[PDB]
Amino acid sequence: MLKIIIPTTMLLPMTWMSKHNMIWINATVHSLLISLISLSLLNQLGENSLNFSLTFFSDSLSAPLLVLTTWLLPLMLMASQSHLSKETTTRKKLYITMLILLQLFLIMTFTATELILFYILFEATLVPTLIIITRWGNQTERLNAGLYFLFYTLAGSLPLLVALVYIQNTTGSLNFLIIHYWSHPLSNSWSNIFMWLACIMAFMVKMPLYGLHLWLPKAHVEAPIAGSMVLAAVLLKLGGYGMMRITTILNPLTNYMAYPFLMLSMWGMIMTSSICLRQTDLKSLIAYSSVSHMALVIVAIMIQTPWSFMGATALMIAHGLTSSMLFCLANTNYERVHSRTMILARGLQTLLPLMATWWLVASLTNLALPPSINLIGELFIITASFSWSNITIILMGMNMMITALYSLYMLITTQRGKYTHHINNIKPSFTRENALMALHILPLLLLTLNPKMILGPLY
Amino acid sequence: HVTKDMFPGPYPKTPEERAAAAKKYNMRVEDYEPYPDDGMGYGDYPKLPDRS
Amino acid sequence: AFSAPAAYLTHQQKVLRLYKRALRHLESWCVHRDKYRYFACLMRARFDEHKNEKDMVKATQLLRQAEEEFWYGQHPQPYIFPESPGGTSYERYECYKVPEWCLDDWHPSEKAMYPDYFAKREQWKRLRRESWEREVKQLQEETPPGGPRTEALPPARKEGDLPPLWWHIVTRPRERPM
Amino acid sequence: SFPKYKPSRLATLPATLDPAEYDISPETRKAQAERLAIRSRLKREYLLQYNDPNRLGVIEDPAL
Amino acid sequence: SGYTPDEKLRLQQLRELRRRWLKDQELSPREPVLPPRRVTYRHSIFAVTHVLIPVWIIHYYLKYHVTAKPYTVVERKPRIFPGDTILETGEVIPLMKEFPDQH
Amino acid sequence: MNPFASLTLTTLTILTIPIMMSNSNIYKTNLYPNYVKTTVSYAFTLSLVPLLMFMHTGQEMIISNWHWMTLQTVELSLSFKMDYFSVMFIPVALFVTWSIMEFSMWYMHSDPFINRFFKYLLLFLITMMILVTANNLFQLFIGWEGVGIMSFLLIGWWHGRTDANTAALQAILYNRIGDIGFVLSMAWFLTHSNAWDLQQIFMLNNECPNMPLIGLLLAAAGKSAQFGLHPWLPSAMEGPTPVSALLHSSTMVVAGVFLLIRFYPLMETNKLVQTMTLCLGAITTLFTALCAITQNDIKKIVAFSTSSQLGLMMVTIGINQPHLAFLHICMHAFFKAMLFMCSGSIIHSLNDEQDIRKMGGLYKAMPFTTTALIIGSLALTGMPYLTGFYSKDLIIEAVNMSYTNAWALLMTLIATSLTAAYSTRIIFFAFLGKPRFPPLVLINENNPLLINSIKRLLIGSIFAGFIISNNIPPMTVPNTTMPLYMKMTALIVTIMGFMLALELNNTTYYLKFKYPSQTYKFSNMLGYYPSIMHRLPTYHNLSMSQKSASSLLDLIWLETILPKTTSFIQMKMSIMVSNQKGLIKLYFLSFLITIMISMTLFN
Amino acid sequence: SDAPPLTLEAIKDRVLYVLKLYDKIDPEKLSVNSHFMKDLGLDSLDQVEIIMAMEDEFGFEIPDIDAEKLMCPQEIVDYIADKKDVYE
Ligand SMILES: CCCCCCCCCCCCCCCCC[C@@H](O)O[C@H](CO[C@H](O)CCCCCCCCCCCCCCC)COP(=O)(O)OCC[N+](C)(C)C
Ligand SMILES: CCCCCCCCCCCCCCCCC[C@@H](O)O[C@H](CO[C@H](O)CCCCCCCCCCCCCCC)COP(=O)(O)OCC[N+](C)(C)C
Numbered sequence A: 001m002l003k004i005i006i007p008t009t010m011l012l013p014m015t016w017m018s019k020h021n022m023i024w025i026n027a028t029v030h031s032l033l034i035s036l037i038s039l040s041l042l043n044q045l046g047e048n049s050l051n052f053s054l055t056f057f058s059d060s061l062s063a064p065l066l067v068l069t070t071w072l073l074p075l076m077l078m079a080s081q082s083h084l085s086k087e088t089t090t091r092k093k094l095y096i097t098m099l100i101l102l103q104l105f106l107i108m109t110f111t112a113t114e115l116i117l118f119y120i121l122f123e124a125t126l127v128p129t130l131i132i133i134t135r136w137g138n139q140t141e142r143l144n145a146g147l148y149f150l151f152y153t154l155a156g157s158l159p160l161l162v163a164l165v166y167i168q169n170t171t172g173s174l175n176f177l178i179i180h181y182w183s184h185p186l187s188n189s190w191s192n193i194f195m196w197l198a199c200i201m202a203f204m205v206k207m208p209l210y211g212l213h214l215w216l217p218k219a220h221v222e223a224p225i226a227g228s229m230v231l232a233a234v235l236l237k238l239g240g241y242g243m244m245r246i247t248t249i250l251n252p253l254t255n256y257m258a259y260p261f262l263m264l265s266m267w268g269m270i271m272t273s274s275i276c277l278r279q280t281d282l283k284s285l286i287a288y289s290s291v292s293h294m295a296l297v298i299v300a301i302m303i304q305t306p307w308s309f310m311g312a313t314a315l316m317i318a319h320g321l322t323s324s325m326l327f328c329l330a331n332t333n334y335e336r337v338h339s340r341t342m343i344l345a346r347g348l349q350t351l352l353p354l355m356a357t358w359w360l361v362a363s364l365t366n367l368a369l370p371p372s373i374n375l376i377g378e379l380f381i382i383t384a385s386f387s388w389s390n391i392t393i394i395l396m397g398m399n400m401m402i403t404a405l406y407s408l409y410m411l412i413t414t415q416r417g418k419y420t421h422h423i424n425n426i427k428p429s430f431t432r433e434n435a436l437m438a439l440h441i442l443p444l445l446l447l448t449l450n451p452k453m454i455l456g457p458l459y
Numbered sequence B: 001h002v003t004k005d006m007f008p009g010p011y012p013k014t015p016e017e018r019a020a021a022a023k024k025y026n027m028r029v030e031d032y033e034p035y036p037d038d039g040m041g042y043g044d045y046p047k048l049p050d051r052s
Numbered sequence C: 001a002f003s004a005p006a007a008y009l010t011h012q013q014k015v016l017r018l019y020k021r022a023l024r025h026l027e028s029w030c031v032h033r034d035k036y037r038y039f040a041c042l043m044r045a046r047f048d049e050h051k052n053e054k055d056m057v058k059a060t061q062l063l064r065q066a067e068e069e070f071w072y073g074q075h076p077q078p079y080i081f082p083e084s085p086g087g088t089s090y091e092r093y094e095c096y097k098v099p100e101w102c103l104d105d106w107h108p109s110e111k112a113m114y115p116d117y118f119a120k121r122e123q124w125k126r127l128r129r130e131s132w133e134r135e136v137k138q139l140q141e142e143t144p145p146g147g148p149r150t151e152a153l154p155p156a157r158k159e160g161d162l163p164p165l166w167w168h169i170v171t172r173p174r175e176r177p178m
Numbered sequence D: 001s002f003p004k005y006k007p008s009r010l011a012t013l014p015a016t017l018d019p020a021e022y023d024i025s026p027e028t029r030k031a032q033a034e035r036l037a038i039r040s041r042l043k044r045e046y047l048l049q050y051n052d053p054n055r056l057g058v059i060e061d062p063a064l
Numbered sequence E: 001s002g003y004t005p006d007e008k009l010r011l012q013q014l015r016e017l018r019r020r021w022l023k024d025q026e027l028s029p030r031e032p033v034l035p036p037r038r039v040t041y042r043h044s045i046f047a048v049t050h051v052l053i054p055v056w057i058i059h060y061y062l063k064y065h066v067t068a069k070p071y072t073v074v075e076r077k078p079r080i081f082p083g084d085t086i087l088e089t090g091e092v093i094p095l096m097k098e099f100p101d102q103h
Numbered sequence F: 001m002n003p004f005a006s007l008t009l010t011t012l013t014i015l016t017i018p019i020m021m022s023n024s025n026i027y028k029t030n031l032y033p034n035y036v037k038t039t040v041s042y043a044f045t046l047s048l049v050p051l052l053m054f055m056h057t058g059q060e061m062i063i064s065n066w067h068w069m070t071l072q073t074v075e076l077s078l079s080f081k082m083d084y085f086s087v088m089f090i091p092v093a094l095f096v097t098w099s100i101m102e103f104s105m106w107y108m109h110s111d112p113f114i115n116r117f118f119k120y121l122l123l124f125l126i127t128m129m130i131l132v133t134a135n136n137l138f139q140l141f142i143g144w145e146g147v148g149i150m151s152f153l154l155i156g157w158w159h160g161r162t163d164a165n166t167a168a169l170q171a172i173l174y175n176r177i178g179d180i181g182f183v184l185s186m187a188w189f190l191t192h193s194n195a196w197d198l199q200q201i202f203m204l205n206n207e208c209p210n211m212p213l214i215g216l217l218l219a220a221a222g223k224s225a226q227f228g229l230h231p232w233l234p235s236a237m238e239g240p241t242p243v244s245a246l247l248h249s250s251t252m253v254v255a256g257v258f259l260l261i262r263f264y265p266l267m268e269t270n271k272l273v274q275t276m277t278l279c280l281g282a283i284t285t286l287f288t289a290l291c292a293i294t295q296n297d298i299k300k301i302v303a304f305s306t307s308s309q310l311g312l313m314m315v316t317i318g319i320n321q322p323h324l325a326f327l328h329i330c331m332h333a334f335f336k337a338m339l340f341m342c343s344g345s346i347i348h349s350l351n352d353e354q355d356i357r358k359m360g361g362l363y364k365a366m367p368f369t370t371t372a373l374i375i376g377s378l379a380l381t382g383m384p385y386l387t388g389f390y391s392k393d394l395i396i397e398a399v400n401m402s403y404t405n406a407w408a409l410l411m412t413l414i415a416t417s418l419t420a421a422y423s424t425r426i427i428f429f430a431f432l433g434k435p436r437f438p439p440l441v442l443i444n445e446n447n448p449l450l451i452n453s454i455k456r457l458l459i460g461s462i463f464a465g466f467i468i469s470n471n472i473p474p475m476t477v478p479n480t481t482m483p484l485y486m487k488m489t490a491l492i493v494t495i496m497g498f499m500l501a502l503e504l505n506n507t508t509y510y511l512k513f514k515y516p517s518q519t520y521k522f523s524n525m526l527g528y529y530p531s532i533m534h535r536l537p538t539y540h541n542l543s544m545s546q547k548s549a550s551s552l553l554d555l556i557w558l559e560t561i562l563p564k565t566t567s568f569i570q571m572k573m574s575i576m577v578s579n580q581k582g583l584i585k586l587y588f589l590s591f592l593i594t595i596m597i598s599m600t601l602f603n
Numbered sequence G: 001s002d003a004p005p006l007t008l009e010a011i012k013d014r015v016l017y018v019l020k021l022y023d024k025i026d027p028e029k030l031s032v033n034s035h036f037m038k039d040l041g042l043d044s045l046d047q048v049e050i051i052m053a054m055e056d057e058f059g060f061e062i063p064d065i066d067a068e069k070l071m072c073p074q075e076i077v078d079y080i081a082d083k084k085d086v087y088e
């Protein structure tokens, strides 16, 4: 695994020893090459895992997340090139350093054979994101947003640490392989109930769970474009990955303890999809859509059936790509209009036709149009839920209908109708933005050809 | 270019601040009517007719 | 559409608007032209019998019973001209309307085609640049103190002046740009 | 006499059936005149800023 | 009623400006200055590039790759009627029970 | 080597080549629409071969060519079903689409984006063929959603028009309501039969339960605009007339019916679902014919006619006669597509005028449209030995000779009469009287594109019923003996419809005016269903979406509970802790207190 | 479409045609600049009828606010030309 970690570390001295006007080119080229190298982790086994060493191991759940993490950095650099133009070389190098450190921590987090090492890196990712949000955000609310994004996380994560060390004091190890092979049932006890809660709540808060989702709209709205991209694409999936790893020690207590979270997610997906219908801000609408999709992923993980896990993996990958694309489109509009109010700039199809095509395809993938991987994950989760209980179909279908409604509402409001007359600074789309949009969308339509790459270890 | 005094505020109680709120929203004092002072966060915002 | 609206509609304007609406809806009811002509002459006669009423209270009690009767028998599916706000081709060609400023973003290779058009466009832009400075002063001196009372604009007064705020009325895209 | 139209939340009263328009007063007329004055002042400010050739951006809207 | 004199004058001036703009929207005889630069017959070539080549590719793919695997193409087991004979075996299906034919 | 599979796949494959060339140079020229039309015609003349092979032998295939992902014991593969329904419907759809494209070459000549329009039409055709030939539920869902997205794009063709966007979103909403049942059925079939393939579904379901069939019926009701989910089809007339003629007239809207035809082995083993389908079809056909007989927009009248015919199709399905419903689909394609041909010709000649109150004497002013529309109306109402006869007459006979609802039978007969009524309404108000259009006459039919495209479907609407009925093998036992009056019931009710509607139309010439009745108002505003159901639910949803979810819970109470409470408590505790005046007297008094307390409590 | 690009001459001729077919006006005294209220002695009801005739003959609707201040055939022609963007 060092053949990916070491180049990502070398990205830092290369960035800091670069010319003042070569940082973006060098960073983009070498991050793309690192993505290409990481692409060879996809050759997974039907047996246990790719156990590289005592410290790092790869799995067909970890490999798609690793590849998406490596692929996201070049897109983040391309998106950040525009709004950082008027800023000094040292500060741009610091921004690229924060992005590189975030990638390094995420890469080490997804392999992380140890649960304490996983926790340490899973919490180390917090610092670069907070600095990016509270340093290079625009509005005055960013500081407040950062505070939320901080404390919520720690409010969930501090009990987990205690639980973790407690387990190693009883089991003797926190290695995931030993934990899986030596797993034992949890008796229905108050102590075991609180151990279950301490294990679950940390990952629940970062999905986020419906009741615990307040930090996400603030953090995603006030963050710069690279921050929003990394928050929606990779950082939300840490909770799902952690739950998928940790639910192996929580059986059979998950059967009883899953009910409040299942109800919260099943009702909150409807609530947040309905919230999307009445939203005056593009970024907030995209954030609430992310909350709905992650609610579906929470349901899938809580059901803990093979089809549930496959659907959850597919949906995590598809949502990451789609939400990053949607945020990039919103930012392309914002850098022209500087308002971030959906109703202000209207009828952009007549002025930006190719960008309108990008908007249409992004809305189509968000709408879960078959045979996209978005719908593959959606349908697998829905079928698993139907087997779990036939009444889930009402909530699932209502969520599908509202999702289509708000996706097409977002498309029609911004692209169709009549152009706003007083806005005359809508310049033609740059090659950088179109390239960014294509680099988001072609991986999705190309992954629909080989779904088993993103269906997880239970395929 | 909007200042702090041009943003929505709390529910107006006295006719003087009622007139100030009406002047803020570019409409007549006789026509200005805020939402009823309930627990909802309507605050100082005109209750225009519900016509589409 | 073009004309600025007033503060209110006078009684005569209300009566004339009711006359036009009732005639159009009767045409919707009376499909054939001879039947429509007969009933429209009857309708005009029924308007004319109270043309000379001097009592304003009487005339206002009238037109009210009349509009109530209209709302009762108003043909819930009246004929609409296709381009009218309720027609089947109302805003059909708005997607083809492109603003004129977009031409400023054209590539030089695009402007290499159509050189005469862009030369005339440059002339128009220069005319706008000078006329605007004249227009601001003329509007400032002609507006009454305390702000305008009606959104009606004055014409040009001198020889070389242009009507104030003319650019976006003169440079409309077209009724059917494509 | 004809059957009466009963307005509702989603089917409102027509303008031509509104008793308030038939009850005119000098105070009503001055209210209409000053409403038109506010609208005209706002329209004048918007068009003055809209037709300006030097302006190269979004016209800021405090109401929005 | 009717237009006020100022309304007439403003409409007339705006009308003249609008008509001059509309006239200026026209194209000169050379206006599309195109930059030139390069680096049964129609039906016969169309039926080759759009019918013959796709059917060749699809027939090759079906006959040599799809049919290679079992159960990929499954047919109907054509209907057998009395009096028919079979190519593979050669035996003749016996006739029916000579029902009474009348009307 | 047995060209059936190769040719039936080559059809669908060559349908996709112009989409590949959509980035080439020809897409930037004016020859692209003719290229697409020629490709579609070649596809039709090539698909005529499997039709002949089936008609000769009855040849059937499943072609599972590409193996896509496998899910433990479930295998998903790209599989095509090439049964009677597919090989019969494909040539009909290709013929209709060929006529539509030739017509569009004239109707949409002034549209700046005509290449795009043609491209959109081809994409819809491709998705429809994917829907029709699918062997498993995932592929058929792909086609199901593809035709819906193409419909959304083509309805909102003029995206500067607010009403077009509203209608497109309406269609999406209703089709998602149907999609709920589609997904329910798919999940049930996977959970219980362990398959989405049709063969395993038929093998393992000898007595199909209620949930999968109810989901299928809900999907069919959504996509074929049945009574609960009907208004989107009349609302869809916002798109260009070729779009209305191809998608929302003859090809896309039958898809729901097609689905119930595709699952007919399971429908015949369930008795309650058949009754539900029959009642839904009966109420749909009655209500839509009732709405049609009073409309003034010609496209609206033809759309309501399409809805009534779809309701009749699902009545046929509900009486357990699926092959008859398929035959009706095939005939209705021809004559309803030609009916929109004539409507679009009239609209174009009269300067985009769609109201029949302004269409006067066109019987002589434009004669080819007149004769084509007369022939189409005769085929629609049911005229002996025309194309619509061989389906509709058998539909009526089967409904009369079955153990069914009395009310459903009555409503089917009334719907037939009202079909005759709205046909004569169109003819009378559009062709017979004196002209009522503006004085400057621009009427012109003399364009070979329009004439040829209309006349191909005209020959279809005359002879296709006879040819197809005499060429397909018999798939049901017929009704050989009937009461003399009960054999004539269709003709009797149709002639009564003509006579009564014509007599009521002739009274419009009388110099007499009266105000409308309650029944007229109910019929004109579509039973008031679009008003109430597009104002009460939507508002009551959207309002809640801002009042409770967005503000009361998300912005107020969820903030009040976790973060605001914590901030308030920590604030107060910090204020209490850090507020000491700096007087060491109080400090050492507390020291004495703590010291005294410490000694006593511990020991 | 195939609609001819109508000119000012056609609009003027068609307006005068419709007006001469109104029998409350004698055609020989009619002129392009003749006022409706005073030069021809017509009531405002006649003026709105004339506007309706123009609408029905040109196939589009003139709004009440614009229609109620059209008092000469010449300015009716000018309004139609401005709405339809006629060059000459
Ligand atoms: C502009 C108009 C169109 C012009 C172009 C016309 C041509 C269109 C043709 C292309 C699309 C049509 C679909 C037809 C697909 C043909 C190729 C396909 O069959 O091959 C696939 C093969 O492709 C791969 O399966 C999918 C590609 C994997 C995508 C990886 C993403 C690239 C990395 C980018 C960064 C990652 C970002 C996202 C993080 C998760 C599936 O093959 P498969 O049967 O299975 O086995 C392969 C062969 N074997 C048998 C020897 C093993
Ligand atoms: C706010 C946004 C979302 C945040 C996250 C929300 C999710 C947290 C929900 C916690 C999951 C369940 C907690 C406890 C489940 C135990 C089962 C219980 O509910 O059922 C009965 C439990 O009985 C009563 O509940 C006893 C406890 C009563 C006191 C609980 C307080 C009630 C409301 C508190 C909710 C506040 C949550 C937030 C706290 C800050 C059965 O009684 P019994 O069969 O005999 O004993 C079963 C347990 N044994 C077997 C181990 C002995």
Ligand SMILES: CCCCCCCC/C=C\CCCCCCCC(=O)O[C@H](COC(=O)CCCCCCC/C=C/CCCCCCCC)COP(=O)(O)OCCN
Residues within 6 Å of the ligand: A152, A155, A156, A159, A162, A163, A166, A190, A191, A192, A194, A195, A196, A197, A198, A201, A205, A212
């Ligand atoms: C987003 C903000 C959420 C804040 C945190 C939410 C998670 C809360 C989970 C509990 C926190 C601490 C749990 C302890 C960690 C696990 C250790 C463990 O399981 O050991 C138990 C110990 O169990 C405990 O001590 C639990 C005591 C909990 C005290 C703190 C209560 C916090 C609030 C309680 C109400 C809310 C609970 C769920 C809240 C969910 C989040 C909203 C048994 O060990 P022994 O006692 O040694 O062996 C038995 C024989 N003697």
Ligand SMILES: CCCCCCCCCCCC(=O)SCCNC(=O)CCNC(=O)[C@H](O)C(C)(C)COP(=O)(O)O
Residues within 6 Å of the ligand: C011, C012, C013, C015, C016, C022, C025, C026, C029, C046, C047, C048, C050, C051, C052, C053, C059, C060, C062, C063, C066, C067, C069, C070, C071, C073, C074, G043, G044, G045
């Ligand atoms: C079929 C649809 C339903 C139809 C039902 C509607 C029933 C309407 C009939 C009601 C009768 C009336 O006129 S309602 C009576 C309203 N009051 C008056 O008529 C008083 C003075 N008249 C005017 O001022 C007019 O404008 C006039 C002088 C004519 C022209 O003026 P010009 O000189 O400035 O053109």
